[PDB]
């Protein structure tokens, strides 16, 4: 179930491993979860003492995880206490090639392996029930940026209560303050 890149399972990871094992042996989500696997997990405190679990999953299976997202989240919400479940693709950051680097960059790094592409993909993967239909970056008078993400309104009831932990986990994982809105008309 868990195959860490460091190959060092933690007890959060083993706990959610038996959690996914319980969901695989009992619920109707048998035929696909057996094929899939994850990599890592972390627990972050956001919103004034409200915890959230994050699950780092290897990239080429996200689309399979995009098929079984909401059902697995609701089943782990039944499984655990009041928490929030989000999935993050394990994205790799290749450093910017400068005039002081090690000789492993014999080809150009892919544009998808850059910092900004990885962070926009991460901000996309934080929100599966919604979709990012807009984005703005407010540069305040102090000089600190603030991203505002406009999500989908047609399904707005699903993730209205989850925007605060979204901002908290993105701030923890990147260091950028973000906010989320819902436009009245597309």
């Amino acid at each position: 179930i868990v195959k860490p890149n460091g190959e060092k399972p933690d007890e959060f990871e083993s706990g959610i491993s038996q959690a996914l094992l319980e969901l695989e042996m009992n619920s109707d989500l048998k035929a696909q979860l057996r094929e899939l696997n994850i990599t890592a997990a972390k627990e972050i405190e956001v919103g004034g003492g409200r915890k959230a679990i994050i699950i780092f999953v290897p990239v080429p299976q996200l689309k399979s995880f995009q098929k079984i997202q909401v059902r697995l989240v609701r089943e782990l919400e039944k499984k655990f206490s009041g928490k929030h479940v989000v999935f993050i693709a394990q994205r790799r950051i290749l450093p910017k090639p400068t005039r002081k680097s090690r000789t492993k960059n014999k080809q150009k790094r892919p544009r998808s392996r850059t910092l900004t592409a990885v962070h926009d993909a991460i901000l996309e993967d934080l929100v599966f029930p919604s979709e990012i239909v807009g984005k703005r970056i407010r540069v305040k008078l102090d000089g600190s940026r603030l991203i505002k993400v406009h999500l989908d309104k047609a399904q707005q009831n699903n993730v209205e209560h989850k925007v605060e932990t979204f901002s908290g986990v993105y701030k923890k994982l990147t260091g950028k303050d973000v906010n989320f809105e819902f436009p009245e008309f597309q």
Binding site: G134, R136, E184, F185, Q186
Partner: protein, 82 residues
């Protein structure tokens, strides 16, 4: 005059503007589900289609291309998708 919030336009001005002159541009076209009156099958047709699109089973004429939007046949039903 000389004072209007450019960041938050009310939807009638954004709908009124040219599609490239909107704050973030968006197309005026859409995809639509059409049902032939002689059958029950559903077909996905672009609103501004340039080619004539035939039925997969009835082989009837569904839409005719014009200068802008396509001209659906009198009798076919349609419903805007998403």
């Amino acid at each position: 005059p000389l004072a209007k919030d450019l960041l938050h336009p009310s939807p009638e001005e954004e709908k009124r503007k040219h599609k490239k002159k909107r704050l973030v541009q968006s197309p005026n076209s859409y995809f639509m589900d059409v049902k032939c009156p002689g059958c029950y099958k559903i077909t996905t047709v672009f609103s501004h289609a340039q080619t004539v699109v035939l039925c997969v089973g009835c082989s009837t004429v569904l839409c005719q291309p014009t200068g802008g939007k396509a001209r659906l046949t009198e009798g076919c039903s349609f419903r805007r998708k998403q």
